UniProtKB/Swiss-Prot annotation:
Limits of the SH2 domain: 4-96
Gene name linked to the record: PTK6
UniProt subcellular location: Cytoplasm; Nucleus; Cell projection, Ruffle; Membrane
Taxonomic superkingdom: Eukaryota
Name of the protein this chain belongs to: Protein-tyrosine kinase 6
Post-translational modification: Autophosphorylated.
Organism classification: Eukaryota, Metazoa, Chordata, Craniata, Vertebrata
Miscellaneous note of the record: The inhibitors bind to the ATP-binding pocket.
Family: Belongs to the protein kinase superfamily. Tyr protein kinase family. BRK/PTK6/SIK subfamily.
Notes on the domains: The SH3 domain plays a major role in substrate interactions. The SH2 domain of PTK6 plays a role in protein-protein interactions, but is likely more important for the regulation of catalytic activity.
Role noted for this protein: Non-receptor tyrosine-protein kinase implicated in the regulation of a variety of signaling pathways that control the differentiation and maintenance of normal epithelia, as well as tumor growth. Function seems to be context dependent and differ depending on cell type, as well as its intracellular localization. A number of potential nuclear and cytoplasmic substrates have been identified.
Expression sites (tissue/organ): Epithelia-specific. Very high level in colon and high levels in small intestine and prostate, and low levels in some fetal tissues. Not expressed in breast or ovarian tissue but expressed in high percentage of breast and ovarian cancers. Also overexpressed in some metastatic melanomas, lymphomas, colon cancers, squamous cell carcinomas and prostate cancers. Also found in melanocytes. Not expressed in heart, brain, placenta, lung, liver, skeletal muscle, kidney and pancreas.
Length: 100
């Protein structure tokens, strides 16, 4: 259990990160919303390609990638993502590995 918060990785680094051979499906990372505003985006290799998601906060202390997945905080929000694959093509697992 570890997403690896990285708010300094473009949609390119993440795409090549999750897809990389450092994750056997399930990898997930929490970066910053390069497109959105004051939020965080998560990317998971799922089971092959790279899937991203926008994490909208409840302005106060609660992140939710959807209207059916909200959590006081990020670390907690993920915990549920791992167990429930609802808003996720593949229940999270380990942190997105890279090459360095």
């Amino acid at each position: 259990s570890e997403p690896w918060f990285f708010g300094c990785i473009s949609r390119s680094e993440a795409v090549r990160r999750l897809q990389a051979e450092g994750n056997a499906t399930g990898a997930f990372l929490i970066r910053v919303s390069e497109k959105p505003s004051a939020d965080y985006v998560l990317s998971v290799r799922d089971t092959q390609a790279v899937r991203h998601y926008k994490i909208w906060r409840r302005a106060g202390g609660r992140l939710h990638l959807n209207e059916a997945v909200s959590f006081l905080s990020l670390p907690e929000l993920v915990n549920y993502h791992r167990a429930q694959s609802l808003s996720h093509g593949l229940r999270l697992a380990a942190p997105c590995r890279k090459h360095e």
